């Protein structure tokens, strides 16, 4: 996590990628930025104040920049690596690889809390039509049909409003804490700027100052630009566990709660094959058939 609070203690503060050392040390701010851990600590050389801070500048950039993508997860277009670290996200086996574990995992691994997703068995629908009149067979059917349609709809909307209370919410709280975490480095940096530049006297102390007093500017120029990227790493992320594990879960049942359902109406339509001609029962089996191989595609709102 995110280890508590920087001090206010304006004392010479450095940075460490160990959680641990961050937690039981006042002056250590936990950072999953290599090279501004490595540019913070070491200090500047000699007088080359100024580039000391632009370094930092620079290393925080192309660090908090970083993105990449898995082409086997298609419907994710920015993944930003360092939130394994940032989070103290880990998986077993995977240290330092969080993108190689996000592969074989997916994007699942970003969850404090796997959820069960599994759909109960979909009951087969029911005809209860016993009247032999061919009309009120013909709508018996058409009615089936158009109950079949529903449920699939039905299902959908159940677990498009599972997702929205109880996973998507997981994913929005990721980009708060990345938020958090992000501001948390901007000031930690800042500070340790601050307070060697209070002890700096070099000749050019005076015309840097403007520079210098641009820096929380700067960097939270560079963290919205990092959020930014990071909003769209959740929200793709979020919608993807959805479009794919959660409703291939629905799928599932719903092929089946459709094999079930046909058989239900064939048995009827043969029960009753006394009362329609021929030429009509060819195209029912048709319509029917055609009707039961055509999945429903997902859609929300």
Known sequence: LYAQKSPTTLQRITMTNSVDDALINSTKIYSYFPSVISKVNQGAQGILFL???????????????????????????????????????????????????????????????????????????????????????????????????????????????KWLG???????????????????????????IDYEYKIYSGPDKEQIADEINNLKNK??????????????????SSRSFLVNQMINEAKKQLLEFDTQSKNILMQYIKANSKFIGITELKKLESKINKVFSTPIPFSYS
């Open 51 to 161: 580039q000391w801070v632009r370094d930092i500048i620079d290393d925080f950039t192309n660090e908090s920049s970083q993105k990449t993508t898995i082409d086997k997860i298609s419907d994710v277009s920015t993944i930003v690596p360092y939130i394994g670290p940032a989070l103290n996200i880990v998986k077993q086996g995977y240290e330092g690889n969080f993108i190689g574990a996000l592969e074989t995992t997916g994007v699942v691994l970003l969850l404090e809390y796997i959820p069960e997703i599994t759909l109960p068995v979909i009951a087969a629908l029911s005809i209860a039509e016993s009247s032999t009149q061919k009309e009120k067979i013909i709508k018996t059917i058409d009615n089936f049909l158009e109950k079949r349609y529903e449920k699939w709809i039905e299902v959908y909307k159940l677990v498009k409003a």
């Open 166 to 192: 109880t996973v998507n919410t997981q994913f929005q709280k990721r980009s708060y804490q990345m938020y958090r975490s992000l501001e948390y480095q901007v000031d930690a940096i800042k500070k340790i």
């Open 219 to 236: 960097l939270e120029e560079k963290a919205n630009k990092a959020m930014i990227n990071i909003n769209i790493f959740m929200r793709e």
